[PDB]
Write an enzyme that holds these catalytic residues in place. Sequence first.
Site, PDB file in Angstrom:
ATOM      1  N   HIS E  95       0.825  -1.187   0.000  1.00  0.00           N
ATOM      2  CA  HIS E  95       0.000   0.000   0.000  1.00  0.00           C
ATOM      3  C   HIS E  95       0.871   1.253   0.000  1.00  0.00           C
ATOM      4  CE1 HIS E  95      -3.820  -1.910   0.199  1.00  0.00           C
ATOM      5  NE2 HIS E  95      -3.579  -2.511   1.354  1.00  0.00           N
ATOM      6  N   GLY E  96       0.283   2.364  -0.416  1.00  0.00           N
ATOM      7  CA  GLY E  96       1.002   3.638  -0.367  1.00  0.00           C
ATOM      8  C   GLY E  96       0.060   4.826  -0.354  1.00  0.00           C
ATOM      9  N   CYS E 138      -0.638   2.272  -4.215  1.00  0.00           N
ATOM     10  CA  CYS E 138      -1.334   3.523  -4.465  1.00  0.00           C
ATOM     11  C   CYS E 138      -0.439   4.710  -4.122  1.00  0.00           C
ATOM     12  CB  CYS E 138      -2.619   3.590  -3.628  1.00  0.00           C
ATOM     13  SG  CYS E 138      -3.776   2.253  -3.997  1.00  0.00           S
TER      14      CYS E 138
END
Lengths: 89, 89, 5, 5, 152, 152
Positions: E95-96, E138
């Site tokens: 995730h980001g 992301c």
Amino acid sequence: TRYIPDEADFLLGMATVNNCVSYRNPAEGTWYIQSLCQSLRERCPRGDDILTILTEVNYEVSNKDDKKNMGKQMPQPTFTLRKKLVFPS
Amino acid sequence: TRYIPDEADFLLGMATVNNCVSYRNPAEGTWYIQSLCQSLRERCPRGDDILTILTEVNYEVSNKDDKKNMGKQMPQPTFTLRKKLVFPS
Amino acid sequence: XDXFX
Amino acid sequence: XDXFX
Amino acid sequence: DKVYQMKSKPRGYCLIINNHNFAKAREKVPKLHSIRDRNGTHLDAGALTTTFEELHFEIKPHDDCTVEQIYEILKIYQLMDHSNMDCFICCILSHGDKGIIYGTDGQEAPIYELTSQFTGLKCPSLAGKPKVFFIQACQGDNYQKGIPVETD
Amino acid sequence: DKVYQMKSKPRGYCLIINNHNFAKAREKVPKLHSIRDRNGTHLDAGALTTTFEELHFEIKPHDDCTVEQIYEILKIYQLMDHSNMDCFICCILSHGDKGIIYGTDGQEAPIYELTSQFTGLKCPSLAGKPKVFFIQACQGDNYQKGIPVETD
């Protein structure tokens, strides 16, 4: 000897432009990594360079759609490469 | 019709990576713009594409030196281009 | 579940 | 003067 | 056209950081209370393994890494001797958010902090050699809108 | 390889924002009290003019623009009809800092705010067409260090 910049010779392949999501199909993998791998496997044996391959990834991912939100995904490479990058096979 | 991402088809040519200076010789112009123009004028008539040309700009600017500070400069393109970009002449 | 990162 | 942006 | 030398066997290391289990983020970081486990991420880890082994890289996979664990892995490779390699690749699957990736703990690692472990000064045995980072995460929570164009 | 169509004559507009005089920044923005006028910038404006006229673009130069004036120029081109063009180029020659360029007044314009005026939704007559931005500015005040490598 010769000197070049400390931050030379990098290639950053981002799955998306800033601020936005990137997609993961739990039954297939992500739009970006699956497209990247398909393009590398098809084009690296032909001698194509990575910027050409990543342009094709941009093309292919740009044609994918999230039909629940009407969403798209735009990958984005950034580079300080000073030469052509090929992965012979 | 077909849909592509809102942010498709961009090319951003930065004179430097983040956090750092870029150089301007008051009697010649900047390291980046002068190198960019020389490479475009030499390589666009050959049919070379802009990512290849910008790689050469990275190479050439990387060999310049600020001998007052022992400084270097690393340009950095970023792109959402989906096709090869050529400027025929 | 069927969707992003 | 002889130098950046 | 100058081309980077790409002749060594193996070409170099290809690190894979494959983050799946975000239970710790959900528990510890209030704004991530609903961020999901990244089901299916192993399909990307496997695709990258097949692809880069075919291209002659030595694959180094790591599953479920907190931010501290990511920096520790990168430090190990920064301190390795790449003299006999021609390239280095790092793939991060996580995730980001804007400019960052999340560890499984929901802590943040700025992308620049990951790539800058491999500058020429920090890793001289990769000086002059291509360093490639692939970041599948992301970079925010907005949806990218579509625009209509004529078909090719 | 697919290639962008590049056949129209002219190919498109090539904007040049050429910032030289920073007296207003020096007067108004305390941290810019010593930022210099960009002597010699006209040599780049001229080089870009020669280069892109040779490549069949229509050159649109603007000298000494504050941030408000830059946004006004970009708005004019966002609202123009590029239907008969194949490309759009914008060159910005100015001072800058992390992620921004400075107007001659020392106000800040984030680079994303400049490029995003030409997204497909804001400028549909450029949808599907290459939009190129060249930014000659600092992005901070650090010097980039050198690393020793073997000669090619």
